[PDB]
């Protein structure tokens, strides 16, 4: 009803049985009111971080809301940027292609928007140059 702590406890319990009881995961991550946004940190992110088709849409729409509410998750953008340099080889091998697809599964515009935060704080010369090149490629007049 309105017991936000009970909602968080139910979300945690559903996360505990997430590998088996997937119905409670959907019912808890999509449970409005109470500690809904508080529970949308590992429940929704689990679908977002999944290797299935969920990452195509959930990560490009639900992770953006979390980033707006709290922009503290830059690991995905950094990992994608690192994998991008090494993704130009072993195309015939299935593992390299799978890793490259997992890195690039997120939308290009969403990935650039998320990595703009790292770009502003890119103290490293190589990181700053890579960020500037990515910004120029995405938008030549930026």
């Amino acid at each position: 009803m309105s017991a936000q702590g009970d909602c968080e406890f139910l979300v945690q319990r559903a996360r505990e049985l997430v590998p088996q009881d997937l119905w409670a995961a959907k019912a808890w991550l999509i449970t409005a009111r109470s500690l809904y946004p508080a529970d949308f940190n590992i429940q929704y992110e689990m679908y977002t971080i999944e290797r299935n088709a969920e990452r195509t849409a959930t990560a490009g729409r639900l992770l953006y809301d979390m980033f707006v509410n709290f922009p503290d998750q830059p690991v995905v953008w950094r990992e994608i940027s690192i994998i991008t340099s090494a993704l130009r080889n072993d195309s015939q091998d299935k593992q390299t292609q799978f890793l490259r697809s997992l890195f690039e599964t997120l939308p290009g515009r969403v990935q650039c928007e998320m990595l703009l935060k790292v770009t502003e704080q890119c103290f490293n010369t190589l990181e700053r140059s890579e960020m500037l090149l990515l910004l120029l490629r995405r938008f030549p007049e930026t």
């Binding site: 009803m1 017991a3 009970d6 997937l22 119905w23 409670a24 959907k26 019912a27 409005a32 009111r33």
Partner: protein, 372 residues
């Protein structure tokens, strides 16, 4: 009409059905535009009974030709005519007598013929008949429609091995029929017998419905407001809570009082319940900003109370040790469905309706937490 039925019954070798269809189309040409809903006209009911059920306006009358092969040929010709009639009037007159009462002496044979003809028409890709089948339960009795649809589904899948894929393809091509079959599936999923437990083909059909029939459910919800405890049949395709409660409690209720089929399929039943819950949550998310109205909130119409009562009846005898997990899962699934439905904004009460309904629900930690 007795005279028209007798006149059209002659020449059963692919000519009687054509004449009957022509006469019915001539009679109901205005009816095709006035109100082409799934209703049975008493004028062409006798013709349909005579040319298909081998029974004229009198129940004890002489059958048309020798029946059997001649009756089969007439049924095939009538199905071909109705599918190509391009009007819902003829198909509705032919098929609607199966479950919607007609108040006729020969209404039982006419109903059997209409059920066979509707099954053929669905298999003969007669889109108007399948589309009107959704409207059939909107104002006619729902129990009879559910029974007829369940019988047709069982004939397609259980009796005919491998034809279930054709039924799923038709349901994809006729989403109105697929949505109308959700209530029939829920009625046939009481877990009181082995057939009540869905098979692998039934699971595939359910997956197909979850993928496609949800759009039909949303379209129906947009067509008319979501009413709470509608007249005799709404056919809203929202029996998710009852189906989930039955499927989760299948290895418990079935074992309490066949039992082995539901007990060994605990993983399959859980997967089907999870898929149904996911489909219901997706539908609720789609029908969340849409004008789905309040008042009712969760789609129960007292079916949640019947499911809770059914679970509680078996929850005291042999459930606490053998299948306590199944009962807990059923209660949690019902509460989760209620909460997710309230998450769409339809249920404008965090604990008012919950205290009104969920207070009498059985004991479950997950369900109690979800409710409160």
């Amino acid at each position: 009409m007795s005279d028209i039925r007798h006149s059209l019954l002659r020449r059963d070798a692919l000519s009687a059905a054509k004449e009957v269809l022509y006469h019915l189309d001539i009679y109901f040409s205005s009816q095709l535009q006035s109100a082409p809903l799934p209703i049975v006209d008493k004028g062409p009911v006798e013709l349909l009974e005579e040319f298909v059920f081998q029974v004229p306006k009198e129940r004890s009358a002489q059958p048309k030709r020798l029946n059997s092969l001649q009756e089969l040929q007439l049924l095939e010709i009538m199905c071909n005519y109705f599918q190509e009639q391009t009007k819902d009037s003829v198909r509705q007159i032919i098929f609607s007598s199966l479950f919607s009462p007609q108040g006729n002496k020969a209404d039982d044979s006419r109903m059997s013929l209409l059920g066979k003809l509707v099954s053929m028409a669905v298999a003969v890709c007669r889109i108007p008949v399948l589309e009107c089948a959704a409207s059939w339960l909107q104002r006619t009795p729902v129990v009879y429609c559910v029974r007829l649809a369940k019988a047709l589904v069982d004939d397609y899948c259980c009796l005919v091995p491998g034809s279930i894929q054709t039924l799923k393809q038709i349901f994809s091509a006729s989403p109105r029929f697929c949505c109308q079959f959700i209530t029939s599936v829920t009625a046939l999923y009481d877990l009181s017998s082995d057939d009540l437990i869905p098979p692998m083909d039934l699971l595939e059909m359910i997956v197909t419905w979850i993928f496609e029939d949800p759009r039909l459910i949303l379209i129906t919800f947009l067509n008319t407001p979501i009413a709470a405890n509608l007249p005799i049949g709404f056919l809203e395709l929202t029996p998710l809570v009852g189906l989930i409660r039955w499927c989760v409690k299948a290895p418990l209720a079935y074992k309490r009082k066949g039992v082995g089929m539901d007990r060994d399929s605990h993983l399959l039943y859980s997967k089907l319940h999870l898929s149904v819950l996911q489909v219901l949550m997706t539908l609720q998310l789609h029908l969340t900003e849409k004008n789905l109205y309040g008042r009712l909130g969760l789609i129960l119409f007292d079916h949640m109370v019947p499911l809770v009562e059914e679970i509680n009846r078996l929850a005291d005898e042999l459930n606490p040790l053998n299948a306590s997990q199944e009962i807990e899962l059923s209660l949690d699934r019902l509460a989760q469905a209620l909460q997710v439905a309230m998450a769409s904004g339809a249920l404008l009460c965090t604990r008012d309706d919950l205290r009104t309904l969920c207070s009498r629900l059985p004991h479950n930690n997950l369900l109690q937490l979800v409710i409160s």
